[PDB]
Amino acid sequence: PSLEDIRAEVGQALERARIFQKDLLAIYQNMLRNYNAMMEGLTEHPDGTPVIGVRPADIAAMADRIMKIDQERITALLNSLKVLG
Amino acid sequence: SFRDRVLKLYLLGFDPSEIAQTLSLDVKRKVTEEEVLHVLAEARELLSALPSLEDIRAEVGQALERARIFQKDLLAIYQNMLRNYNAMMEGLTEHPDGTPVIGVRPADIAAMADRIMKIDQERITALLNSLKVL
Amino acid sequence: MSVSFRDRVLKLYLLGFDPSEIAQTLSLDVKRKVTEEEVLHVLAEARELLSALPSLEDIRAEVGQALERARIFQKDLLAIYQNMLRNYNAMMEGLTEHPDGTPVIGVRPADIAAMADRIMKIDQERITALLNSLKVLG
Amino acid sequence: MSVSFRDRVLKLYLLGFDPSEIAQTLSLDVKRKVTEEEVLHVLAEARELLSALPSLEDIRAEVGQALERARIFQKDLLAIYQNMLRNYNAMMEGLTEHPDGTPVIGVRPADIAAMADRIMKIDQERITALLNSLKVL
Amino acid sequence: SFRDRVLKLYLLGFDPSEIAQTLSLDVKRKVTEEEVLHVLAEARELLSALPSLEDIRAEVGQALERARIFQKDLLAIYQNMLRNYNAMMEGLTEHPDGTPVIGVRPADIAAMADRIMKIDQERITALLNSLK
Amino acid sequence: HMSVSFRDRVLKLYLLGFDPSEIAQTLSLDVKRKVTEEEVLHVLAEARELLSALPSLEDIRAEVGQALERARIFQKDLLAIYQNMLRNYNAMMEGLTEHPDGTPVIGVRPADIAAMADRIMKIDQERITALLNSLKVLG
Amino acid sequence: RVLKLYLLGFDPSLLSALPSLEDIRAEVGQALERARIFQKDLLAIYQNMLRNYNAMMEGLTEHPDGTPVIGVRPADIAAMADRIMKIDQERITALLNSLKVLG
Amino acid sequence: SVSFRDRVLKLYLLGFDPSEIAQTLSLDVKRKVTEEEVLHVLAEARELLSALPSLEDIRAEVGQALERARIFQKDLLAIYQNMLRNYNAMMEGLTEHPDGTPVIGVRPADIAAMADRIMKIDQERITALLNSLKVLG
Amino acid sequence: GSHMSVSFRDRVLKLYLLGFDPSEIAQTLSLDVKRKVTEEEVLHVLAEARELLSALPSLEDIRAEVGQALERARIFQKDLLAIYQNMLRNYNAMMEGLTEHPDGTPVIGVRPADIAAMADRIMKIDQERITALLNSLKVLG
């Protein structure tokens, strides 16, 4: 394996992590949707589906998982730059 | 768009043969395994490039803005946790607007406060690090 | 178009909406039909602005706002800590109800210590953040 | 445009209300109509003030206050610790009720040790903070 | 004493206006915000002084005597736990003195031993620093 | 490979915590003769000496390669499972107890999905990268 | 009676002075001895844990002496072993450190 | 003689005191084993245990540890495959495999945890092999 | 071979280290030695014991400690290995439907994660051995 093989693996990993991040971002909006519905007393959404219970801590934990993906991306990009100097 | 879709399926576990047949049925034309391998190899070259520090800063900036959006959500949730706590204290099972008072523990409020404060901390750390690379 | 328009393209990109979804959602707020290509170009302009080196003066402003936000929470937690002690002492003297008619809620010594710790950490974090602002000069 | 007014603008901004919500929430309180632009200006001036370089002397004052606050908590925890022992000792010799009629509440040994450790950690953290304010010179 | 009570209420979470109102009613005169802020400012000035290392040895010292007292409590509890474990091992639900057998896990006993040992370790370390 | 399999079987059972006498009595079946406690102790002493040998660089390269092969496999297994978790999450979100193929909808929490995503990202970014960097360094 | 009550958090209504190296050496010695005493207690408990695990393996709810078989998990036994081995390790570290700094 | 001494050492290291050891071995083979015989055996054991390892001894330990971990890895790999098998059956409705054995449900997190444990054995193996060159011989 | 003077010393020290007051130690041991032992004697005994325990180890003592610790760990490791095998046996029995082993004993459920955890405890004992052996060759030779 060359240095270009390992940089490609990292680049591909970071691109895959962006896919996961996007899935989690969609889940986070579902979590808010359910929370805000539970707040204003609905037991059922407009679409007929049930208002699922969501704890504030779960929402903050999801936000953190999403923010950590950015951080890990930033750290990986910095570390590949560090091999020069 | 075709180059992006090939990459995406490769990254979700599809091998180049499977990508060739799957994408042959999305568009009209028959694409080959070798054409998929060529498209992936070109994306590998792009993805293997050394990043620029300017691009890294743009990622920090975007990440920090994303964190601010979440932080604003959590700040609203925090107010609603206090509303429910201050109601739960007064013995109410029900708010003035009729919605139920949800149970909230002291630890949960402290934990949410900590989550919001950590977002400020991470923002300051990331900003200082962008300067520290000088 | 506007300052608010570019802000909303960024927000929706950062919430995970793909370009075409951002386009349609913004077409409703203005006269024209916003396209994918107009969205990608506003996003790329936003990335350009976000690549700027920070100002340490601006960083100190973020520290100040963060520490002030922490003082607000700290004041909330301090009141909650007193409520926790009120519950604990009512529990100690055998009461199911407070003098104001409200229910006594069960509180463990570990919960009270944890809350005290959370409050003390906020001071610690303030001191650390203030010191880090001076440390970066040297 | 008072200090009580300006502090309230900053507080609501830090609690997650946007400038227009802040404008309206201040408008309906006083016989007055406050704008967004005015709220934005107050916040901008608060950022300028908050961008000041800190003072190590002020930081020592924060360390002093933090240690005093920690003493207050340590005193509360010491009292709780004595209650825990009282209940453990009563629970040890069979009782469900103290001399004065108050109930014997269940205390585990691990809880007593954990509380002792919390109290001792406040002593230790006192010293570490005192050493750091000198060591930063 | 008035400066201490102002500081104390501030540190318990009262804002300067709440301190002013509540203390006005206690001392029977208009105590104003300006006065409370001024009294807090003075209390900060005293607290902003550099610590002496002769004082830091007094704090390093009194920590260790308090820790000794806790250690002695924990040691007595540790004996109670073993007494309970050895009874519960050999079938009993009641001790020689009529007091009940209370359940104890092996892990609980080990954790308590570890707490007691940690106090000795912390004492040694802090005695070495009390010379340093 | 009759003496080598006997040697390996003795070591394996020693490494799984069997008494030398239990090893002797067990392996007497495999080799159709009365193996003694003294023999297995001698076999273990000889195995100890062999295991004190240093690995060659080629030994290590092969070990790294076998480990890289395992990591790729695990990464693909978890990707399929992750997608099945999303399928279940989405079905659940729209009120279905049953999938289009007649199989039941199993409950899945947002945290479970995030955790699985992290498992996969750690394989990509830590496990595989470290093994690749070891291959490079070894030549 | 006087100082003990102050340090336990009651209000009224030298200990700042340095110890000798001799005293610190004595403190180290006593700590290590106390640890040996605890170690011996845990070793006996470890044996009773295995006896219970072994009876639990053979379906017994009662040992030969009539006493009840108490449920023990493999993780609990491993953890207890770990506690006992840690006391040894902490002894070795403290002994080395005493030669470094208290000779 | 050799089995006898090993058993004295074992019981000592298990927290049995010399008097108790002497008594328990006096019954194991019927003769009055003294405390002073036990203490002589244990003093001789301490001497042997005091001996430093050679570098060769350490390499052998590294080698045996690698092999032990490999044996565990293969057990874990077999358990992983089985957990997969049961995930994919529980997925498509089933409560019984083709061979009659029951389907036992498995959580995704548990499958991922097992993968991670197997890969952890791998990084420990590679680290130990590399440290065999960089640290030993 | 009598050793009752040292037994008295050890027991005074032991009870002190378990948190008994000198006066209680005196009252308690008066039974053992059939003699009226005073607080003051117990205090002198503790003071003498403090002096003795303040003696430094030799390097030879530390070598011996290391060696005993590693042997003790070998013993626990062997217990854990036997427990590991039972766990596997039970897991495999459960996998193929059995409620009872060939020896008549009941199949008791086990989680894969707990088998993994036990293997790791056993593997850690090896690495801790290697670490301690290396350290002894470094600093005690």
PDB file of N, CA and C in Angstrom, chain H residues 39-76:
ATOM      1  N   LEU H  39       6.636 -23.511  56.198  1.00  0.00           N
ATOM      2  CA  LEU H  39       7.400 -22.256  56.096  1.00  0.00           C
ATOM      3  C   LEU H  39       8.730 -22.434  55.352  1.00  0.00           C
ATOM      4  N   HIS H  40       9.333 -23.618  55.465  1.00  0.00           N
ATOM      5  CA  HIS H  40      10.548 -23.959  54.708  1.00  0.00           C
ATOM      6  C   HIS H  40      10.249 -24.145  53.215  1.00  0.00           C
ATOM      7  N   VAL H  41       9.132 -24.800  52.906  1.00  0.00           N
ATOM      8  CA  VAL H  41       8.707 -24.979  51.514  1.00  0.00           C
ATOM      9  C   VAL H  41       8.404 -23.620  50.870  1.00  0.00           C
ATOM     10  N   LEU H  42       7.707 -22.750  51.599  1.00  0.00           N
ATOM     11  CA  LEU H  42       7.343 -21.412  51.106  1.00  0.00           C
ATOM     12  C   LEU H  42       8.531 -20.450  50.956  1.00  0.00           C
ATOM     13  N   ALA H  43       9.530 -20.573  51.835  1.00  0.00           N
ATOM     14  CA  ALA H  43      10.782 -19.810  51.710  1.00  0.00           C
ATOM     15  C   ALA H  43      11.579 -20.260  50.488  1.00  0.00           C
ATOM     16  N   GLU H  44      11.592 -21.570  50.236  1.00  0.00           N
ATOM     17  CA  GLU H  44      12.205 -22.125  49.021  1.00  0.00           C
ATOM     18  C   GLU H  44      11.442 -21.727  47.754  1.00  0.00           C
ATOM     19  N   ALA H  45      10.111 -21.642  47.843  1.00  0.00           N
ATOM     20  CA  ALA H  45       9.276 -21.168  46.725  1.00  0.00           C
ATOM     21  C   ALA H  45       9.554 -19.696  46.391  1.00  0.00           C
ATOM     22  N   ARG H  46       9.612 -18.847  47.426  1.00  0.00           N
ATOM     23  CA  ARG H  46       9.975 -17.419  47.284  1.00  0.00           C
ATOM     24  C   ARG H  46      11.307 -17.176  46.573  1.00  0.00           C
ATOM     25  N   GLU H  47      12.301 -18.014  46.866  1.00  0.00           N
ATOM     26  CA  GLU H  47      13.616 -17.957  46.213  1.00  0.00           C
ATOM     27  C   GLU H  47      13.523 -18.214  44.713  1.00  0.00           C
ATOM     28  N   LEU H  48      12.820 -19.283  44.335  1.00  0.00           N
ATOM     29  CA  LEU H  48      12.609 -19.611  42.912  1.00  0.00           C
ATOM     30  C   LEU H  48      11.820 -18.521  42.184  1.00  0.00           C
ATOM     31  N   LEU H  49      10.769 -18.017  42.828  1.00  0.00           N
ATOM     32  CA  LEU H  49       9.949 -16.951  42.251  1.00  0.00           C
ATOM     33  C   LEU H  49      10.664 -15.602  42.152  1.00  0.00           C
ATOM     34  N   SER H  50      11.654 -15.362  43.012  1.00  0.00           N
ATOM     35  CA  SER H  50      12.483 -14.142  42.940  1.00  0.00           C
ATOM     36  C   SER H  50      13.368 -14.028  41.701  1.00  0.00           C
ATOM     37  N   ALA H  51      13.634 -15.144  41.033  1.00  0.00           N
ATOM     38  CA  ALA H  51      14.535 -15.158  39.895  1.00  0.00           C
ATOM     39  C   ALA H  51      13.984 -14.303  38.745  1.00  0.00           C
ATOM     40  N   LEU H  52      14.860 -13.500  38.151  1.00  0.00           N
ATOM     41  CA  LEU H  52      14.492 -12.670  37.027  1.00  0.00           C
ATOM     42  C   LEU H  52      14.267 -13.525  35.801  1.00  0.00           C
ATOM     43  N   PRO H  53      13.355 -13.086  34.916  1.00  0.00           N
ATOM     44  CA  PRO H  53      13.273 -13.721  33.623  1.00  0.00           C
ATOM     45  C   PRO H  53      14.466 -13.317  32.769  1.00  0.00           C
ATOM     46  N   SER H  54      14.833 -14.201  31.855  1.00  0.00           N
ATOM     47  CA  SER H  54      15.673 -13.852  30.740  1.00  0.00           C
ATOM     48  C   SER H  54      14.788 -13.205  29.669  1.00  0.00           C
ATOM     49  N   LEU H  55      15.420 -12.538  28.722  1.00  0.00           N
ATOM     50  CA  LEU H  55      14.739 -12.052  27.538  1.00  0.00           C
ATOM     51  C   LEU H  55      14.030 -13.193  26.784  1.00  0.00           C
ATOM     52  N   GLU H  56      14.690 -14.346  26.693  1.00  0.00           N
ATOM     53  CA  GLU H  56      14.109 -15.555  26.094  1.00  0.00           C
ATOM     54  C   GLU H  56      12.803 -15.979  26.794  1.00  0.00           C
ATOM     55  N   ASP H  57      12.781 -15.928  28.124  1.00  0.00           N
ATOM     56  CA  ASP H  57      11.546 -16.220  28.866  1.00  0.00           C
ATOM     57  C   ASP H  57      10.405 -15.266  28.490  1.00  0.00           C
ATOM     58  N   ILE H  58      10.729 -13.991  28.300  1.00  0.00           N
ATOM     59  CA  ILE H  58       9.724 -12.986  27.996  1.00  0.00           C
ATOM     60  C   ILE H  58       9.171 -13.224  26.603  1.00  0.00           C
ATOM     61  N   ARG H  59      10.049 -13.496  25.643  1.00  0.00           N
ATOM     62  CA  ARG H  59       9.614 -13.828  24.279  1.00  0.00           C
ATOM     63  C   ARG H  59       8.663 -15.022  24.244  1.00  0.00           C
ATOM     64  N   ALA H  60       8.963 -16.045  25.035  1.00  0.00           N
ATOM     65  CA  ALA H  60       8.098 -17.214  25.133  1.00  0.00           C
ATOM     66  C   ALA H  60       6.719 -16.840  25.669  1.00  0.00           C
ATOM     67  N   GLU H  61       6.677 -15.956  26.663  1.00  0.00           N
ATOM     68  CA  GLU H  61       5.394 -15.470  27.195  1.00  0.00           C
ATOM     69  C   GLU H  61       4.591 -14.709  26.137  1.00  0.00           C
ATOM     70  N   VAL H  62       5.272 -13.865  25.366  1.00  0.00           N
ATOM     71  CA  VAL H  62       4.641 -13.117  24.277  1.00  0.00           C
ATOM     72  C   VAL H  62       4.036 -14.086  23.269  1.00  0.00           C
ATOM     73  N   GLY H  63       4.821 -15.105  22.925  1.00  0.00           N
ATOM     74  CA  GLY H  63       4.431 -16.136  21.975  1.00  0.00           C
ATOM     75  C   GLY H  63       3.234 -16.932  22.428  1.00  0.00           C
ATOM     76  N   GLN H  64       3.230 -17.337  23.691  1.00  0.00           N
ATOM     77  CA  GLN H  64       2.111 -18.101  24.232  1.00  0.00           C
ATOM     78  C   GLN H  64       0.868 -17.245  24.349  1.00  0.00           C
ATOM     79  N   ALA H  65       1.041 -15.961  24.670  1.00  0.00           N
ATOM     80  CA  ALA H  65      -0.099 -15.057  24.816  1.00  0.00           C
ATOM     81  C   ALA H  65      -0.793 -14.824  23.463  1.00  0.00           C
ATOM     82  N   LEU H  66       0.007 -14.622  22.410  1.00  0.00           N
ATOM     83  CA  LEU H  66      -0.489 -14.544  21.030  1.00  0.00           C
ATOM     84  C   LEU H  66      -1.302 -15.765  20.632  1.00  0.00           C
ATOM     85  N   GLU H  67      -0.802 -16.943  20.979  1.00  0.00           N
ATOM     86  CA  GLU H  67      -1.486 -18.174  20.638  1.00  0.00           C
ATOM     87  C   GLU H  67      -2.777 -18.337  21.450  1.00  0.00           C
ATOM     88  N   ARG H  68      -2.750 -17.977  22.731  1.00  0.00           N
ATOM     89  CA  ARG H  68      -3.960 -18.066  23.536  1.00  0.00           C
ATOM     90  C   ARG H  68      -5.067 -17.168  22.965  1.00  0.00           C
ATOM     91  N   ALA H  69      -4.679 -15.962  22.570  1.00  0.00           N
ATOM     92  CA  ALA H  69      -5.592 -14.989  21.989  1.00  0.00           C
ATOM     93  C   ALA H  69      -6.144 -15.467  20.649  1.00  0.00           C
ATOM     94  N   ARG H  70      -5.302 -16.129  19.868  1.00  0.00           N
ATOM     95  CA  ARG H  70      -5.743 -16.755  18.623  1.00  0.00           C
ATOM     96  C   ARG H  70      -6.823 -17.821  18.872  1.00  0.00           C
ATOM     97  N   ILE H  71      -6.639 -18.654  19.892  1.00  0.00           N
ATOM     98  CA  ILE H  71      -7.627 -19.689  20.220  1.00  0.00           C
ATOM     99  C   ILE H  71      -8.945 -19.007  20.570  1.00  0.00           C
ATOM    100  N   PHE H  72      -8.882 -17.990  21.435  1.00  0.00           N
ATOM    101  CA  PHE H  72     -10.067 -17.211  21.777  1.00  0.00           C
ATOM    102  C   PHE H  72     -10.684 -16.568  20.548  1.00  0.00           C
ATOM    103  N   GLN H  73      -9.861 -16.026  19.659  1.00  0.00           N
ATOM    104  CA  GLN H  73     -10.395 -15.387  18.474  1.00  0.00           C
ATOM    105  C   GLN H  73     -11.249 -16.343  17.648  1.00  0.00           C
ATOM    106  N   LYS H  74     -10.798 -17.587  17.494  1.00  0.00           N
ATOM    107  CA  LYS H  74     -11.535 -18.591  16.711  1.00  0.00           C
ATOM    108  C   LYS H  74     -12.855 -18.979  17.372  1.00  0.00           C
ATOM    109  N   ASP H  75     -12.872 -19.075  18.699  1.00  0.00           N
ATOM    110  CA  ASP H  75     -14.128 -19.262  19.420  1.00  0.00           C
ATOM    111  C   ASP H  75     -15.079 -18.096  19.159  1.00  0.00           C
ATOM    112  N   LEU H  76     -14.559 -16.874  19.224  1.00  0.00           N
ATOM    113  CA  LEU H  76     -15.384 -15.685  19.035  1.00  0.00           C
ATOM    114  C   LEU H  76     -15.893 -15.587  17.583  1.00  0.00           C
TER     115      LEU H  76
END
